Amino acid sequence: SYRIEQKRNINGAFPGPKSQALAERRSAVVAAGVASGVPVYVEDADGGIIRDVDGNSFIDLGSGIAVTSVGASDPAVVAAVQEAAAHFTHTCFMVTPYEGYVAVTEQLNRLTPGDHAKRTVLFNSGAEAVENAVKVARLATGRDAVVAFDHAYHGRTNLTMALTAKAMPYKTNFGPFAPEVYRMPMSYPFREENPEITGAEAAKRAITMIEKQIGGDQVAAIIIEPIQGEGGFIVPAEGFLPALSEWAKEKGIVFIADEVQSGFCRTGEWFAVDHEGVVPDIITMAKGIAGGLPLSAITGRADLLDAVHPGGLGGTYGGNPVACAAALAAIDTMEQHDLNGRARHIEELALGKLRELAAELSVVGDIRGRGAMLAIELVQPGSKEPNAELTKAVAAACLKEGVIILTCGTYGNVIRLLPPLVISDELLIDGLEVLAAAIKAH
Amino acid sequence: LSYRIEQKRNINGAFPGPKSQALAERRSAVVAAGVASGVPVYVEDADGGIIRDVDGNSFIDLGSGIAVTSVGASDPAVVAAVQEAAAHFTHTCFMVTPYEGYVAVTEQLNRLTPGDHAKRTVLFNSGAEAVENAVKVARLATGRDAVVAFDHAYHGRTNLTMALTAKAMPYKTNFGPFAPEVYRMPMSYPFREENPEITGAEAAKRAITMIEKQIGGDQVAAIIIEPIQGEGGFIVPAEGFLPALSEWAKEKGIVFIADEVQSGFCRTGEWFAVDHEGVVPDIITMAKGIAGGLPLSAITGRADLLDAVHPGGLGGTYGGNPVACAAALAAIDTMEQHDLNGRARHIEELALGKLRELAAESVVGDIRGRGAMLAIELVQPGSKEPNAELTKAVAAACLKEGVIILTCGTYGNVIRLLPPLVISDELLIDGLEVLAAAIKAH
Amino acid sequence: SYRIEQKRNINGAFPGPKSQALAERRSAVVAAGVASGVPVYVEDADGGIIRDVDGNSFIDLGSGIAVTSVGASDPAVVAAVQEAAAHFTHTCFMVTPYEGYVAVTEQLNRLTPGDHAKRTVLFNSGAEAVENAVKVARLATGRDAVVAFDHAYHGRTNLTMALTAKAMPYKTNFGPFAPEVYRMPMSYPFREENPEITGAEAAKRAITMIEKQIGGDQVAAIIIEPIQGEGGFIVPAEGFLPALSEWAKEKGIVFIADEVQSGFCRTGEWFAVDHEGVVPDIITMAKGIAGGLPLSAITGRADLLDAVHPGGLGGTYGGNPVACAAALAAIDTMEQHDLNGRARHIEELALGKLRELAAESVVGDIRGRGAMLAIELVQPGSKEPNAELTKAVAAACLKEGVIILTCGTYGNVIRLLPPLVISDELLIDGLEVLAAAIKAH
Amino acid sequence: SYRIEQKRNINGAFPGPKSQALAERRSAVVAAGVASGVPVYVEDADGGIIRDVDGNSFIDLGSGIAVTSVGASDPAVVAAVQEAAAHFTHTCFMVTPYEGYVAVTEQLNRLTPGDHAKRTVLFNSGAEAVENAVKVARLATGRDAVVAFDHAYHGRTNLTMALTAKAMPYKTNFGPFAPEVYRMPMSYPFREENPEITGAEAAKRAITMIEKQIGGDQVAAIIIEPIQGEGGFIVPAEGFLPALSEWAKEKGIVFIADEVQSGFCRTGEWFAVDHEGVVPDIITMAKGIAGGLPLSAITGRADLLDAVHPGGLGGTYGGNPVACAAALAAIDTMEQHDLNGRARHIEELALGKLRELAAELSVVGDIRGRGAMLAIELVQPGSKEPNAELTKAVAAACLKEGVIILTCGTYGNVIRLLPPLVISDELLIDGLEVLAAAIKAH
Ligand SMILES: Cc1ncc(COP(=O)(O)O)c(CNCCCC(=O)O)c1O
Ligand SMILES: Cc1ncc(COP(=O)(O)O)c(CNCCCC(=O)O)c1O
Ligand SMILES: Cc1ncc(COP(=O)(O)O)c(CNCCCC(=O)O)c1O
Ligand SMILES: Cc1ncc(COP(=O)(O)O)c(CNCCCC(=O)O)c1O
Structure with missing residues (x-):
């Protein structure tokens, strides 16, 4: 209706x-x-x-x-926004907290994959979310290097530009870019030089390369979109994502799924990683989360997120209460209407x-x-x-x-x-x- | 008031x-x-x-x-504006399907910012995003790399804005390595000057000589400064400092960026803190007060700088959100109506x-x-x-x-x-x- | 004898x-x-x-x-070293110049590929040579990015580590590394996923990737070893190097051949690029140049090297006179004994x-x-x-x-x-x- | 004679x-x-x-x-060079070692300050020496940041350019520069804004600034010339160097003295640090070491240098045997003729x-x-x-x-x-x- x-x-x-x-x-x-x-x-x-x-x-x-x-x-979202705005537009959670922030975090805890202890922080843009996932990986592991992939897109801030593969229009003349970012080959079935290559084999290729050119014990995070968006809706061959996930666990590398574009029911599951049952260490979210209001999030292992010192993650607008009202309604609609x-x-x-x-x-x-x-x-x-x-x-x-x-x-x-x-x-x-x-x- | x-x-x-x-x-x-x-x-x-x-x-x-x-x-106006706008559409992404709210907010910022020269504006969500984009423009437009920021500076929590930020705890510790080609220069901080008699002009000469000897004026893309340094401690520079930097920046072809995220929109008794001394910045970064609590941020600067950026080079998904724009128009309106x-x-x-x-x-x-x-x-x-x-x-x-x-x-x-x-x-x-x-x- | x-x-x-x-x-x-x-x-x-x-x-x-x-x-090198040392060990060319430096430079101008105007500067190590090629590419072009390849090795300084591919033992725990360095795939015939891939096709793969991920007009230099040394004496398929060279010229990118290991007769020609007649914009040299004495060099287009401002390139020891005597002798022996x-x-x-x-x-x-x-x-x-x-x-x-x-x-x-x-x-x-x-x- | x-x-x-x-x-x-x-x-x-x-x-x-x-x-150097060249010009110590290298290392161990366990590696240029000191500091401490000073000069490679203060002619248009290098104020008596400032106070100024802008526990190394050469033979006020040394020890920071210009009798002591009895964690040497032949060195704490994995430090020419013969002779002349x-x-x-x-x-x-x-x-x-x-x-x-x-x-x-x-x-x-x-x- x-x-x-x-x-x-x-x-x-x-x-x-x-x-x-x-x-x-x-x-x-x-x-x-x-x-x-x-x-x-x-x-x-x-x-x-x-x-x-x-x-x-x-x-x-x-x-x-x-x-x-x-x-x-969505009438629910509209109503939620309208009601919340009438109470307060902003107080900055880091100063005076509010239920909306907590409530949203409760939902994201529940809906994200894995049954382990998780925590969440909220921001505004997808770029901010990825920026914060990488801050956490870097602090929690004590390591520097981050690997991203061919055809990756992760944002328009300096670091997220760094993480992004395509130069036009996202990068040209905007550098120099954040250091210690390394690029590795993607599983892109339609353009593989060897059309018969399996996901497992595509993973082994990336892994060997990471190991030879950085070393697994030097990598803070592997960041990948389960389905690459701007790169061209590239879906990796079956067996690629689990192989990277398993290897990351073995080497103590934070595995970050960027579900900014693919998250929240977009792919037929709550998250794109759910197609293969991959359980990421941190997942970055925005876009669909709040039905159009500006909200973004990272949800990941409690031990990773709780490693960050007091006041190390945040921002002014982040987890805006009107946006939060929108999100709670938006998620509610996702469930009510399947x-x-x-x-x-x-x-x-x-x-x-x-x-x-x-x-x-x-x-x-x-x-x-x-x-x-x-x-x-x-x-x-x-x-x-x-x-x-x-x-x-x-x-x-x-x-x-x-x-x-x-x-x-x-x-x-x-x-x-x-x-x-x-x-x-x-x-x-x-x-x-x-x-x-x-x-x-x- | 009521x-x-x-x-x-x-x-x-x-x-x-x-x-x-x-x-x-x-x-x-x-x-x-x-x-x-x-x-x-x-x-x-x-x-x-x-x-x-x-x-x-x-x-x-x-x-x-x-x-x-x-x-x-x-503010009732803001609330009303938000309520009305949300019922029409929450988001279409301006880069895809544009809308009046974005254009109207840009009209206002053009008018209210200092200087009578041709100006243009782009909108984003956070202050950090704003500063990130001001620097992208400076870098692209000038074809240079180096950006100078100051002691006691604070500009944000993305990798680059951390780079620009002076204080390490809690904003930076263990979150690097940081974006390259950022240089830090001494601030005019009257209360703690080693020579209490130093004038603003002299404080500016000190910075300028140091920039010239350690980078070279013709190598600097931007000087970025908060007219009143916020998180650094509401440090107000001595009279004559800002205009000296502005004048020198013009001489050397360096973009002068005023970070008015905290000091902008009537906060200091003028529309912008630079107005106290009649400094006219090449780009000014804005957020916070702009939208009465809704998440919006902006850069407004010389048309010749901002128009230099190639098509699709600046942007984001949420940026210039329509509900936030409604809020801003109303917020600015209240700032004028109630002086x-x-x-x-x-x-x-x-x-x-x-x-x-x-x-x-x-x-x-x-x-x-x-x-x-x-x-x-x-x-x-x-x-x-x-x-x-x-x-x-x-x-x-x-x-x-x-x-x-x-x-x-x-x-x-x-x-x-x-x-x-x-x-x-x-x-x-x-x-x-x-x-x-x-x-x-x- | x-x-x-x-x-x-x-x-x-x-x-x-x-x-x-x-x-x-x-x-x-x-x-x-x-x-x-x-x-x-x-x-x-x-x-x-x-x-x-x-x-x-x-x-x-x-x-x-x-x-x-x-x-x-080599008796010639020894004699030359012995004689030059007795006159002066060092004066620093940037302060008080000397014939040895100029002479070596004359030889390198002559022996390097191409008939265009070339100039040379001298340093001590191969890493220093590569460092200075990149400085020149960057200053001359006004651009930032430098592309290197898989299996590259170029040195142990922060930037030459950055340029080097293999992490153990050359890089581990020595970063963070110098910025704006990008890595591209090499033509490595024995391990190509498609064994039938030609040199031209390998080049196109690299070029498309550079273009999509950096943009040709953003790249200051492409640096490659004509035969990759520490990477495993990888020789690229015929047609790879000329394709990269041609493209670099088209896009205004400095093409740097790293001939530190492959230079000076080592491969059967004066330089490894000579096998395919590729003419680099700058070439980096060390090792064989001075018969064991510490000397290194860059020789490249006069318009590139002359772009650098006075005192922009140098060092203390660089172009040491004893090392120069050794080089002149060493090059002489290379010619006299074919x-x-x-x-x-x-x-x-x-x-x-x-x-x-x-x-x-x-x-x-x-x-x-x-x-x-x-x-x-x-x-x-x-x-x-x-x-x-x-x-x-x-x-x-x-x-x-x-x-x-x-x-x-x-x-x-x-x-x-x-x-x-x-x-x-x-x-x-x-x-x-x-x-x-x-x-x- | x-x-x-x-x-x-x-x-x-x-x-x-x-x-x-x-x-x-x-x-x-x-x-x-x-x-x-x-x-x-x-x-x-x-x-x-x-x-x-x-x-x-x-x-x-x-x-x-x-x-x-x-x-x-020097006849001794000339003779030594002449004799050594007749035996072999080079074998590359990493491949086939030789006495000259070891002998030089024995001397440098003995002549450098401190009675603690020390080790040495040899290279060719001063730049290479500083590069290697920083590699060690970074690998041994597991930290990133390196602090250098105003008026510093350390070389013409990308990193040593980074470390160097003056841009003309050493740096202009040669960047972008190696990341995580931070610049701190020097004790430069003649141009102190407060002419009465003591060395101890100058040190405190640097230390507070390092602590506020990086954090002691984030700094891998502090690198300083005991007398700044190219910067203008700046001699810090008495008490500055020991203060930095003491603080570095406390915070686990490698203190690198760059004695490339000041080392080997130049200042009236074996090393310029000997004037104040500062004992550095690593010291970088070149220039005078080998009487004009190209040789350079780092000598530092055994626990730091031995921390580097096999084959992590080196080069082709480094510790060249003819240069080593020259050095042994040069050092010998320094002693014999006081x-x-x-x-x-x-x-x-x-x-x-x-x-x-x-x-x-x-x-x-x-x-x-x-x-x-x-x-x-x-x-x-x-x-x-x-x-x-x-x-x-x-x-x-x-x-x-x-x-x-x-x-x-x-x-x-x-x-x-x-x-x-x-x-x-x-x-x-x-x-x-x-x-x-x-x-x-x-
Ligand atoms: C996969 C993925 N990650 C991050 C982002 C960035 O999110 P925000 O724009 O900061 O909210 C995106 C964005 N994709 C849409 C492209 C927008 C553009 O500006 O071109 C993403 O897909
Ligand atoms: C001067 C100045 N510039 C940028 C920002 C960043 O704005 P956002 O918080 O990303 O919207 C700010 C913000 N200052 C508030 C400090 C935030 C915190 O996390 O503590 C600013 O003042
Ligand atoms: C191709 C190529 N380029 C540069 C170097 C570096 O030469 P220097 O050792 O800095 O003089 C090299 C060196 N190759 C030998 C590497 C052995 C090592 O472990 O250092 C090179 O081959
Ligand atoms: C104090 C100090 N440290 C390092 C160096 C670098 O030594 P090399 O020139 O690379 O061997 C120097 C060198 N100073 C001489 C400056 C000459 C120049 O390059 O202009 C130094 O003084």
């Missing part, structure tokens, strides 16, 4: 007048480099629709980059339609992902060379028909589906039809 | 009370041990100058959440009055600050040696009597007044009387 | 009494970690022999890690005997050029490394009076680095002892 | 024809930037004379930057003549140093402002008269006397007369 009509509806040309008016204002005051993928301006976002200031209704297949999984306007189930159902629908399309075409290199985090990697016809041209084209074509869809990938050639998990089957099918049509058209 | 909850100090028996204790018990099972709070009671409502706890106790708020809730923790600059100047007069009366009745080393950002540096009796022990004592004493007051300083010996600017004279005086009684008592 | 008898001769058990005496003195005063691969102490080294203080004569198949290519006692030719002849002999051994399995790969050759040892019937056999063989060779070195990322490569003045007779004797040792284990 | 006539003799204009011929050759093949302070080319250097290729004889007041303390042509005594005698003569000059003038700011490591800091007439102009002038004037003298200093305004210790009284006086005349002339 929704608030605004859940149907795709484009009334004439866009951007419309009111959108154009805003663009004009924008170019006088916002930095030129801050671009938007979409030229229309939101007035309402709800269920699977973005409606613009000129009354056009677009299908939302990005959920704000995997943020509004509960929908951009969004894990909704995500699994989306996978079935969408992989269905996408595989039908593969069977007609050839420009479709690889279809992959889990739950509501799915992707199609587009290639040059008859080879494996990347096709970023087609990818830009298809996004634009979708936008023209009233479907907002995101792209990604190291080679710029991956279309990603990140619908809100509360999307209706009707809308999702409509979106997929538009997408399918667009690919065939170019 | 408030929602009774604006009187009122402590009903022992605290923490039962409901606060119940929350502390829940907390210790789920929140990291290191995340400590200065205050053992839990907020239910925060409004005007009162923090009221879950057990009905009403404390005087002399910290405004570390200079965040300048408009008050429950909080004026209120801040009036607070300066009242508080510096009472504090100087106390000095006249010796443990009071130095009284300093501007507006609603004031401090008393406490020393050992009859000398200049720091007195952290008395400082902790006084803060505890004040808490006991129902006044929440913050401390800071490189040497742990500074009591800081950061009341909300909407505080009543009656409450402020009560608070200052309690503070003055506490100092005399220990 | 040699000075000491060029025959292998072990008189009983070693270390002998005089060597033992020195070991005892050593353990009181030299840091415990500073270990030597050989337990006997030199008194004379000449041609292909190391003779110890107890009169034992070992075959020298390491030349001091590719340093004494002209021999550890050591390039001697090196090529050594390749023929040694690859011959090594391939015979492969016939009759533990021999994974035989590779190298000139007097820089290697055999990579593997577990019987697979490609798994065999460091155990490698240590064993080295020890077995030592026992029989042959000093031979090991190397490799996986600790499983026997390397031949004989002095280029070695006699066929001695070399064959050494190779027979080596072959015997491999068969024995 | 000497080999070439020990008298100043300039025969007409220079550079002469043969020198000019070499300059012409040079400019085609040596990098432009590699400049020499002297335009004539050496043929022989012996005792206190540099004789050029055109037969001119200059007084040598630099000893090759404090290298040829025994003279540039160069400590000669240095002390030089101090008396030179400080005498320099103080006479001070009494006539005013442009002489400060006279300082010990032994044969002495300096005069030149200032603007009647003030303390630096006088680099006069300093360059005086060096050129001295050169014109046939006296080669060096300059240095953070501010470019210090004349330094680094004569070889085997210089005759007659020659030294002649040189000082020329210098005194030059200062009076400009």
